[PDB]
């Protein structure tokens, strides 16, 4: 029994065990929370808020571990209302949490928040790749438009903003981002 327990523990990454990133077949999962929303599979907004609040914490921990200070935004990991307060100008509130009853004309704040988080992840990828070009992340990102290129396949591009976008493409984009985070986590843990 002791040998089995030791062999299990010797491979238990701390970040991977705490914020476990995995697939559900169509939903990118963090700690068994479903970061997505599909018609055939509904997702209450509370679960999405929890998923964002956990992804924010994971990326905040990795950024502090690497010592990176993001150029243009600050990550505030608040439990179930996490938000990115724009570093360059502390006036605009960007919440990674939505209260339902969508009014898309006024709820551009959530879209801006997701775009800013994609920007932060792009900076993280830039640092990772510049540090070592031998390691390459599986997906490509573009921040001028808020898109994720499907470099792992046909090359179709997907939008991370729910507005102007379908639910399926949104979920697939978030799945690609979570895969990016998992591989970046692997590299970050390996480098140290």
């Amino acid at each position: 029994y002791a040998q089995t327990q030791l062999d299990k523990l010797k491979k238990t990454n701390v970040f991977n065990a705490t914020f476990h990133i995995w697939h559900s077949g169509q939903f990118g999962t963090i700690n068994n929370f479903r970061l997505g929303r599909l018609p055939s599979v509904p997702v209450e907004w509370n679960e999405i808020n929890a998923a964002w609040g956990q992804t924010v914490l994971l990326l905040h921990a990795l950024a502090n571990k690497m010592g990176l200070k993001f150029q243009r935004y600050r990550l505030v990991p608040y439990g179930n209302h996490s938000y990115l307060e724009s570093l360059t100008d502390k006036s605009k509130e960007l919440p990674l949490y939505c209260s339902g009853g969508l009014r898309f004309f006024w709820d551009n704040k959530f879209d801006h928040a997701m775009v800013a988080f994609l920007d932060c992840v792009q900076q993280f990828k830039e640092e990772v790749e510049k540090g070592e070009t031998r390691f390459c992340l599986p997906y490509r990102m573009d921040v001028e438009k808020g898109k994720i290129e499907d470099t792992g396949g046909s090359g179709g591009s997907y939008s991370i903003k729910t507005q102007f976008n379908s639910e399926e493409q949104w979920t697939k984009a978030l799945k690609f981002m979570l895969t990016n985070l998992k591989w970046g986590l692997a590299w970050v843990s390996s480098q140290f």
Binding site: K10, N13, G152, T179
Partner: peptide, 28 residues
């Protein structure tokens, strides 16, 4: 592309496990 993504996940987890095992062995 679902199978390809699942293969990506499996390979990433295997690499993480191998890297951590190497780190622990070097610690030893």
């Amino acid at each position: 592309d679902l199978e390809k993504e699942n293969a990506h996940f499996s390979i990433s987890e295997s690499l993480i496990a191998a890297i951590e095992l190497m780190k622990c062995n070097m610690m030893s």
